[PDB]
Symmetry: C8
Subunit: 144 residues, 8 copies
């Protein structure tokens, strides 16, 4: 079935490899192995890195990949890196927002600091690309 | 007739559709690229040209003509809780095509009032200004709770 | 010497009628490209400079100008009844007969008489393909009254 | 004499004119490209260089010098219902050359007042700012 | 009485009617100024008085084959002298030459540029900075500013 | 004798070499040696230098590298070059900010000067790329006792 | 009248330019300067671009050495033939080093009376004064000049 | 460990000796070929170092500038520095002494310094650190004149 609370931030190369198999991306196992992609790097993967460093030339294939990564990010356990439980805060707003947890905690944001965050920061620093999402997160952050 | 549940389509249903619209030539590319319903609905000019090998702008226009038809008469119920499809359709039947674009950003009826022109263009993929403006206008004259 | 039929239902034209028109206007040389690219009425009415150069192989700007001269004539005298419920054709024509050529551009965006008042300059240029500023300005002005 | 009806010229008359002005070398290109009166009047720098193969900027300048003459002394009556030709000419004989530019956008005397500087440049092909400004000024005060 | 125009250095004739010059007179002038090397190019391209007066950096480099910026500068130095002392009577009905000359003798060189756009004394008051640069080919800002200033302070009533 | 926090500013080529081995970047030992990277240069290393001069072509590899370097920078002993103890000031704000110490002291900033620092300075001169971090550091700097 | 102290560079011919190149250790470039027909006027107006592309001086360092010599020459040159209003002494009074800008200003037809109206853009683009510090000083002093 | 070296007056030979002392003998040939003397050494840019002197590595350039900054910090500028800007800059911060030649080359002195802008200190005088620019500017506005 579908894995329950995987601790992706603490994943090692081997766990990333397993996940690539499960989602039907075995073709890319070699690249990910050579590049030594662990949990931290997987969560922070960009379009650019995927295309140039991991050899995923097709925009459609990349879209499929990010579709899977988004799913993983949505259901991951962030407890090692998420002391204030931003995951649950984001999830309460909309389950789909949970995917942004690692982006926020990687900049050192927590519940208490969230109120002061700017739109630019959510886009550039936290990697929230959808305006709709940014706006909703911003709004809710100002009112808690 | 029956409206196809394109959001839930798999590669095989996409392959069938390509045949029906006279694009059998492209079946192999779509198979290789593993285009399912979700990816079909979200297909861009760029992806069509570069990743699927549809070099001609005219051919791409023909393709989008067919895709727009499909999108107009698709069943979105699995992914469209608030029934944005009918809201769009009531404005103009041709706007139903934008359903998946809106629900893919997590918009629904309640959130629609707050949407910006930039958001409709960049996030939702509504390319025609005329359409954007009409959708924006009608969204502001909704229920604001 | 005007191509026959006059007052044609270009929106409903198929490849064959496009082919016939190309012959009549002395562009037989391009029949093959139009055939290969499967240009019908709808696509002919929406044809761009870019598509004409790249996809249909009309390399000369002067040849493209000759082509658009003919296409403008066709668009000016075409029957748009199937696709133009609000009769934008007559509205445009009343302003200036030459403006009737913009009918398909306006109806293809889903504009009609009632919506026209709200249209912007950007919309007329980008969405409706009205390239001449003079024309855009006149159409815009008249739209803001109705 | 009588001014030639350049708007109605066919390929053959364009060919004749090229010979007369000493541009015989370009007859073949003009023939291949099927340049008639309408296209001759609307010819751009770009078309002349790329489509007609006139590589030299100096040669193009010589060509436009001849074309401007032709435009200045052409008969526009078929296409110029409101006689913009005479209006332009009265301002400055040299402005008659812009007749076809204006009538091709569907302008006439009555509409002229509403024209903008951008429109005269982009739509009508009036490249000299000085000329644009004078035509604009006079158009607003006939209103 | 600083008249070096009666000097041996200065190309003959003095006060030439350059607007009416034909290829042959252009050829003669090239010889006098030590640009014989370019005679062939100018002949081939059929440069007459009107084209000589209107010549641009671009035409000089690409169409006439003068690849060096320094050589072009030398050329324009000579052309500016010619333009400064030329007779513009055929083309300058309102005597813009004298108007420009009264401001500064070296501004007379702009005469053909101004009359070529259809400027005259009466119209000069309305001229813009853009027009002097793009239409008249006055490249030096200092010159543009002085001409502009003087034009705005003209009596048109 | 072994110190807890390493004195990276005083490191020589040999200590840099050792560190590369420990973090699994032995592959790059040669490049670092040829380029004569010491502690000072290691602390000041940029993306560009890492790619072009040290031959680390992969953006993923560079990310792994900087992940290790950030840790080193966070826990380094800066006492030789940090007379006013900006390290502890930054650390008090957030332990993760200690990584910016060498950036600040390399421009000649100290506690007394910190109040005057601008956003542009923190970005261009000090190399603080994260907006969130800049803003927090800036805020705290303005509200200091001069 | 045989040897002058301050050289009349504006009136120099090719031959005097050639001699100067030899003296400053740039004999290697004599042929290029000869071929390009560089006289005093052109020497004084030489740009970075012309020096690199037309005269073949590829190195930025070599160009810097060249301009170091040219700046000296420009600073001490006699401009009397072309400088009626004595802008040279005006510039010199501000700072001796600013005398090097004389030919740049007189070549645009500036003089003392016109100086008050000059703009920063003009000093940079038309007169070739590249150092902002120099432009600012010249601009400041020019604001206290009397115009007509 | 040179005491007050008169770098502005240095000839090719002294620059060569200096290169040897700092472990850059590899670059002696290029510096010789390009005829780098004291004046050119003090005014050297990243661009000239890369393109004209063949120092391809950014890291090597950084090492070089580290040495040059040291030399500039300890140099005797008396030939070119009549108002003793060197001591004024040094009194502010010993690390500012390195900017002496940049300032005096533009003809600046103690009395003029106040009129300089931040852009001028960057573009004309080659002061790359914003923090340094701002500190020099501030102190210049508050100084005692005659």
């Amino acid at each position: 079935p579908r894995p329950i609370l995987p601790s992706v931030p603490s994943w090692k190369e081997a766990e990333v490899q397993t996940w690539l198999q499960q989602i039907g991306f075995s073709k890319y196992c070699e690249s990910f192995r050579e590049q030594q992609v662990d949990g931290d790097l997987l969560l922070r993967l960009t379009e650019e890195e995927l295309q140039t460093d991991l050899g995923m030339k097709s925009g459609i294939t990349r879209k499929r990949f990010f579709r899977e990564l988004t799913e993983l990010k949505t259901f991951a356990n962030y407890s090692t890196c998420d002391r204030s439980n931003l995951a649950d805060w984001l999830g309460s707003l909309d389950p789909r927002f949970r995917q942004y947890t690692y982006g926020l905690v990687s900049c050192g944001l927590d519940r208490s600091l969230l109120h002061r965050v700017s739109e630019q920061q959510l886009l550039e620093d936290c990697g929230i690309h959808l305006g709709v999402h940014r706006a909703r997160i911003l709004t809710a952050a100002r009112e808690m």
